[PDB]
Design a protein around this ligand. Structure first.
Ligand SMILES: [Zn+2]
Length: 193
C-alpha cells in the first residue's frame, strides 16, 4: 500500500517552499529547484516552509513520511539502518528506527502505521509568525543515503501531507532527499544531468 505522492494543493492552497534557511548553517543543506531535491548532512537541521492561501481549521496536522523513489523499492519501508538503530543517542522521544525527526516542536508524534508498518512524524499545523507568509518546520534525517542495511544508496521522497484531526487528506506535496557528506557537491553533480 505505497503512499501516494500526488501533489494536491487542496482547498487551502497547500504547498512547500525552500527559500528560507532560517537557522540552518551554510554547508549543511541545499535545495535544487530543478530537481525538487533537498541535499542535507546527517543529523543536521533542515528548514522546510509550508505555505497556504488560507489558514486551515483547528486540529489540522502536518505529516512527514519517506518512501523509496524507485518503483522496485517502493513497497519497502524506509527505516534507520541496523548500525544507527542500535546507537544510543536518544532518550526515548524519537524512536531509533525513524529516519525523520522534527526539531524544536514539543508536540511531535512519532507514528508507526498499524497496517503498513511505515514510520512518520506529525506535528500540529501552526500559522506563520506575525509578518511572515510561511510556517517553518525543521527536520533532521538520521541516516545517510548510503547507509548499508538502510537506504543503501536508494533515493527517497519525503511526502508532506496536511490532514484534518481525523486523518483526512487536506493537501499534499513532496520533495526528493539525499543525506550526504557534502550537499553542495552532490547537488552540483546531479544537476549536471
Ligand atoms: Zn544509518
Amino acid at each position: 500500500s505505497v503512499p501516494s505522492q500526488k501533489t494536491y494543493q487542496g482547498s487551502y492552497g497547500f504547498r512547500l517552499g525552500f527559500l528560507h534557511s532560517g537557522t540552518a548553517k551554510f554547508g549543511t543543506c541545499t535545495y535544487s529547484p530543478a530537481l525538487n531535491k533537498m541535499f542535507v548532512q546527517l543529523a543536521k537541521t533542515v528548514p522546510v516552509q509550508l505555505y497556504v492561501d488560507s489558514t486551515p481549521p483547528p486540529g489540522t496536522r502536518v505529516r512527514a513520511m519517506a518512501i523509496y523513489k524507485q518503483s522496485q523499492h517502493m513497497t519497502e519501508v524506509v527505516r534507520r539502518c541496523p548500525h544507527h538503530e542500535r546507537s544510543s543517542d536518544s532518550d526515548g522521544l524519537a524512536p531509533p528506527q525513524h529516519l525523520i525527526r522534527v526539531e524544536g516542536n514539543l508536540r511531535a508524534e512519532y507514528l508507526d502505521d498499524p497496517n503498513t508498518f511505515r514510520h512518520s512524524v506529525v506535528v500540529p499545523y501552526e500559522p506563520p509568525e506575525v509578518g511572515s507568509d510561511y510556517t517553518t518546520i525543521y527536520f533532521k534525517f538520521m541516516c545517510n543515503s548510503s547507509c548499508m542495511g538502510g537506504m543503501n544508496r536508494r533515493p527517497i521522497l519525503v511526502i508532506i501531507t496536511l490532514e484534518d484531526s481525523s486523518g483526512n487528506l487536506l493537501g499534499r506535496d513532496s520533495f526528493e532527499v539525499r543525506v550526504c557528506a557534502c550537499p553542495g557537491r552532490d547537488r552540483r553533480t546531479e544537476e549536471e544531468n
